Ligand binder design. Structure first.
Ligand SMILES: O=C(O)[C@@](O)(COP(=O)(O)O)[C@H](O)[C@H](O)COP(=O)(O)O
Ligand SMILES: O=C(O)[C@@](O)(COP(=O)(O)O)[C@H](O)[C@H](O)COP(=O)(O)O
Ligand SMILES: [Mg+2]
Ligand SMILES: [Mg+2]
Ligand SMILES: [Mg+2]
Ligand SMILES: [Mg+2]
Lengths: 480, 139, 482, 242, 122, 123
């Protein structure tokens, strides 16, 4: 028959199954192009699977391959579109885990689309039977692809110019209890916290609209609290109004409402997902709104060293998408944060370019293509007795958020806010004078000295001075 | 061409012995059988003509096969299908439908194309048998 | 002295300072679960030295109302009502220092019809807490009252089969390959050939959206010509899952409206689009008479490992609530991970009107589905027609079996690949209904060989892929036997 | 003929008229579900009508029944959808009047739709010949159905917070005469009443828009009266604009 | 006319029996959108009462079976069928499913009879 | 569809689409902002977009001053027209064959190599 006569008989395109490493997805000699997307995967092959074949399988099934040969490849410029695994190294202090570098052609990806990038890079390969664990550790997003994205709507520089605040970290606090407060009482807490010294407060990530408080009641009452505190202090003030909602239509309604009443800032939760996040990042730029991203749900895939997505990749994707803030860890608070990994995340969010820095998890040199800088946010279980550590680990361009550390103050919310602000300003003043403030002999004394003339700070130090969260980290470096 | 509606149309035409086994399977699950006829093979012809009422209270597969063969004696040339209905909460729908009879020659269909806006085409699937003759004398 | 000092709270519970979560009201072994409560089952691996009850109470507290230090503003609320309660902590069988923790959440904590709000509480922060070295969300009891605020599937299995006029066998599909690189014209050719050869559907690959080698409108228009050609050639309803995944909600809607305007029966979305876009398009699909296929892109980044993440059975619940019509749910025997006890559990969650506790299958809660429509599972990835007896056995009747490489990789062409798959499917269902012990290796393969004797395409496919298997150790496995 | 051969011959689905209480709409043993909608009817049967048959008739004609058997029931999960009268008691101190309790499956009702709930519960049964009088006395709306509804837009608590008024009943007054006043005089009455101490005034129910006063005239003049009274008192004031 | 007077304490019972709506007030209202005369002209049916039927059972049918009943009834001779008053949109049948299937049944019966046919879509 | 205002251009484009035309044409005198607007529209509305280069020779004719048409070729391929007039060599309009061959390469190739006789100064 004509079907039989025209069967393909070549080595590569005769029907049947051949190893991915023989299909063009492994090339140890591949010359990386400056327009390629690069990915670094930590691969744990199943017993008996060849490490190079596993890396070729990841490259194939995240680009153009499937499990058996298809003649339709020959209708395309097939060699151009195949991704190439081009380097596989053993992970230090491991016999059966590997670092695999994979290069992807620029043309594989829809311009400006995080959904399309992730559909390829993380779409299916994490469920592949032949690999028992897989983690995306880093990516090199080329200058050409970055220019198709907006980057942060506002960015660190314009944000400080909008707030007229330069020289210290910014200060914030999540309203507590997480759930249950009324809109009127929400505005009271915001008013007290801002009046006592905070730059911002914020809705908790799970405060959206609920029987105990519908969202418009919260928004109007918070704007009264914000404007009251601004008039009481002479400062720009705000509160992250949470616009997270079930549908894009409802998200936009909450965003438009916050703009209509004059809020400087809104917040969104990562659980809303990449398409909603990109939509609202464009909206935030078009509507002169600061856009705070809470990373709700990130740790379901970002916690364990063997499998998932390292948060440093999320940092890159979210700076590309264009949020203005993102939570990025504290080191010393209640949530996981190895200092080398955290310093790596902060560099990724804030620098104009990245150099290889393996102890910090920076595996690729990468230019940020003048996309604006994203403000990291340090939040969760921190208190003002840690100020020297926070300044040392996290630097100048960060929002330090003290929820329990403000509202839990025995003398009231205003006193809690004042304690945090005096601690912050005293530490920065001493740093700039040249104090060796990270030293345990110096930092804590700077705070005790400021507390001798600030009752709220003395009380805060008395209450929390000894609180620490010291546990073995899961997300740790591979290089010293 | 072969009309490949129904769930067994990529197999040869079912024998009566094969049909009875499918009927027995459905009836052992408590499903209600019915028989329907058409000579409009269009894929959107949802409502073939009923051959009586569904056989809700029948327990013997031979009684279903009896009605099928009475339908075959009485209906004009065309298609007959056998359906099994599940009235259980969560389904309340047909759960099996296959062709029991088909014409010796089915000319099939052509694709009618109307120029829409831009490059869009407005499509109509047209049956040769239906456009040529009225119901009851198409095959 | 000062008024602030005089009015300081002095009680054990609300004086300032840090106390354990299990003393803050978040642990209650005597708690009586309400039928309106949201229930969650977590697999908790505490850090060494962390009490298992304190770890469970920390999860309950930090996913409901607590923070790390006591706050007096609790007293401005009906605080006892809003606290979640860990109420049961069991050791995991055959494990050292891993526990199953049951936690109850008051109905009023959650925004009606909002998956984003539900997940903001349940998974928002607790997976990053230092005091727990690993955490996995294993199951949830979504109560009838909360389920009624959600749409459930836009179409559902029953109406889907009625729209397609297809009843009696699984549905059949195939992803177009190569994954990337084909033109819109050549995409339409593959769709035409596959549908004409017997498939009910083809689909865009998950990473096919709009790209330099093929912009999306070119694909959509050419596929509609292929679809209508195949429908006129066969007399059947045909379709292809047009991928409307895009960067912004505006662009997703543009692609969805275009698919509707040209008459597509179905569109597809990727899970990486995220919950808010997914719920938006699920409402849109109901309002616009469109089938909605969900590809679960990215799911395995958190669903693969037993110690940490979210078990996919919970994703199944959330996506059936959100209202997708299809979701990929595993094959057991294909190229992607799937322990059969886990997979069977996923399929039950997607398809049944109610769930009974069934610990071997990972069903930890009894749960009524509140008449939300049934979601169609999709079995896809590295499967071939020589496995048909296994597919029918594990996966049942209401499923889409998708053969991408298993269709297009056929040596005699795409039509032949599709015909092989359809003949294998129909022969296997016919024999099942006749009473065959078809899952038996001495029976199932023979049913296929019998049909191949009169179907050349099937014989060729069996010859080609007969010995292909993906037998690997599973990571996502059961904790109970039967 | 095939239609004669396939006629349904069961007791329940052979064609013809049978009593509602034999069609599944009466079950003294029915176990009420927490998701059921419950209705309490005061039923006055016509003379000679059995009170249980009357209750089953209300249950049937407000759920799935009609007056004669239909085979199309068999295309549905018919037992799930039938409402069940499950308790009939005599009304105290009454001759031939009964309280009848009826349970309705949750799935009968469109979510969040009062029009659909009432289309079933009050749609036709009040006109039934066999019942000389019928009154809907109470309903148990289950938690699951309530969650589909918004409930009050504002509610008592948020209302008092918007008005900054706590500790006493609120105070109001309808403007009088009911009809005939001009918009300018309407605003005057509203100004005087609010200034004198009332929290609210209100349009009469039949004050909409009329030759003697078109509605925009009333609205703008009342807003002047409201804001004047607010500035004269330091209170939030308002008037219910119809 | 009915606003408050039916609750007046001083009156133990009150019934509105009839009203004279004057010509001048009536002219402000549209009256029937179509009316009997234009309705019969749209249906091309004159000389007998019109014929209809409510689909039964009242609740529970799927959209597909709803269209089947409508098809059968129209083909058998009815001018119209209708949704039951409590058939709106429900778990067992969402309204668009009913509307599309009924339009197939209506047009099938029209082509089978040469008459205008319809069904009151609720 | 060339017209005085963008509103009128869109009206004519939408009309052409509504009646099923495969193609529309625009004049370069409409200018860069209108051209980019209609190039996006053409992609979004499945329309071929033909660019007539009206006025080009007012600045492209003389060797000593202006803009060489090969630069216009790059800017218009960037903007996204589907056709552009690019010369004949042997017809009634100016066109040295080395220059023309350079224009055609710029419009049609996936990449350019330095080719000084064709006027291609940049890779
Ligand atoms: O809900 C919470 O616990 C917080 O409001 C912190 O409250 P406290 O300030 O009272 O601790 C923040 O959302 C977490 O810090 C998020 O963690 P991350 O920044 O690591 O995403
Ligand atoms: O890209 C792929 O590999 C596939 O198109 C399969 O192609 P083949 O049919 O050629 O294998 C599907 O997206 C995966 O099956 C998804 O996996 P899951 O269903 O587990 O989410
Ligand atoms: Mg929080
Ligand atoms: Mg795919
Ligand atoms: Mg009145
Ligand atoms: Mg009725």
């Amino acid at each position: 028959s004509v079907s039989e006569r025209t069967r393909i008989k070549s080595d590569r395109y005769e029907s049947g199954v051949i190893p991915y490493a023989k299909m063009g997805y492994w090339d140890a000699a591949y010359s990386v192009k400056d327009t390629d997307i690069l990915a670094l995967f930590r691969i744990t092959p199943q017993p008996g699977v060849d490490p190079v074949e596993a890396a070729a399988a990841v490259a194939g099934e995240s680009s153009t391959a499937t499990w058996t040969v298809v003649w339709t490849d020959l209708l395309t410029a097939c060699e151009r579109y195949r991704a190439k695994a081009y380097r596989v190294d053993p992970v230090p202090n491991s016999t059966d885990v590997y670092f695999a570098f994979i290069a992807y052609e620029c043309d594989l990806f829809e311009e400006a689309s995080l959904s399309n990038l992730t559909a390829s890079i993380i779409g299916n390969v994490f469920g592949f039977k032949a690999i028992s664990a897989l983690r995306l550790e880093d990516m090199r997003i080329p200058h050409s692809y970055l220019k198709t994205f907006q980057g942060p709507a506002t960015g660190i520089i314009v944000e400080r110019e909008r707030l007229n605040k330069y020289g210290t970290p910014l200060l914030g606090a999540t309203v507590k209890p997480k759930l249950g407060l009324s809109g009127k009482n929400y505005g009271r807490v915001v008013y007290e916290g801002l009046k006592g010294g905070l730059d911002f407060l914020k809705d908790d990530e799970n405060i959206n609209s609920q029987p105990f408080m519908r969202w418009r009641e919260r928004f109007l009452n918070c704007l009264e609290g914000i404007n009251r505190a601004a008039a009481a202090t002479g400062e720009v003030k705000g509160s992250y109004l949470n616009i997270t909602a079930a549908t894009m239509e409802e998200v936009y309604k909450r965003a438009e409402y916050a703009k209509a009443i004059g809020s400087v800032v809104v917040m969104i939760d990562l659980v809303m997902g990449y398409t909603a996040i990109q939509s609202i990042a464009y909206w935030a730029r078009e509507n002169d709104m600061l856009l705070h991203l809470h990373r709700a749900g990130n740790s379901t895939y970002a916690r364990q060293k063997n499998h998932g997505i390292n948060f440093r990749v999320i940092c890159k994707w979210m700076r590309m998408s264009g949020v203005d803030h993102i939570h990025a860890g504290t080191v010393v608070g209640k949530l996981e944060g190895d200092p080398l990994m955290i310093k790596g995340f902060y560099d990724i969010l804030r620098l104009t370019e990245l150099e290889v820095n393996l102890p910090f998890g920076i595996f690729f040199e990468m230019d940020w293509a003048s996309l604006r800088r994203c403000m990291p946010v340090a939040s969760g279980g921190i208190h003002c007795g840690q100020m020297h550590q926070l300044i040392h680990y996290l630097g100048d361009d960060v929002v330090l958020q003290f929820g329990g550390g403000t509202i839990g103050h025995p003398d009231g919310i205003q006193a809690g806010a004042t304690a945090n602000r005096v601690a912050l300003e005293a530490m920065v003043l001493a740093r700039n004078e040249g104090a060796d403030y990270f030293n345990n002999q110096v930092g804590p004394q700077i705070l005790r000295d400021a507390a001798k003339t600030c009752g709220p700070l003395q009380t805060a130090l008395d209450l929390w001075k000894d609180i620490s969260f010291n546990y073995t980290s899961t997300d740790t470096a591979d290089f010293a | 061409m072969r009309l490949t509606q129904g769930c067994f149309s990529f197999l040869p035409d079912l024998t009566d012995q094969q049909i009875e086994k499918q009927v027995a399977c459905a009836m052992s699950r408590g499903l209600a059988m019915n028989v329907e006829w058409t000579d409009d093979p269009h894929p959107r012809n949802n409502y073939w003509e009923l051959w009586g009422l569904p056989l809700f209270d029948i327990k013997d597969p031979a009684t279903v096969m009896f009605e099928l063969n009475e339908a075959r004696k009485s209906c004009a040339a065309g298609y007959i299908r056998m359906n099994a209905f599940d009235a259980s909460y969560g389904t309340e729908s047909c759960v099996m439908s296959f062709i029991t009879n088909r014409p010796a020659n089915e000319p099939g269909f052509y694709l009618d194309r109307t120029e829409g806006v831009g490059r869009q085409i407005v499509y109509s699937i047209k049956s040769y048998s239906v456009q040529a003759n009225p119901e009851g004398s198409r095959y």
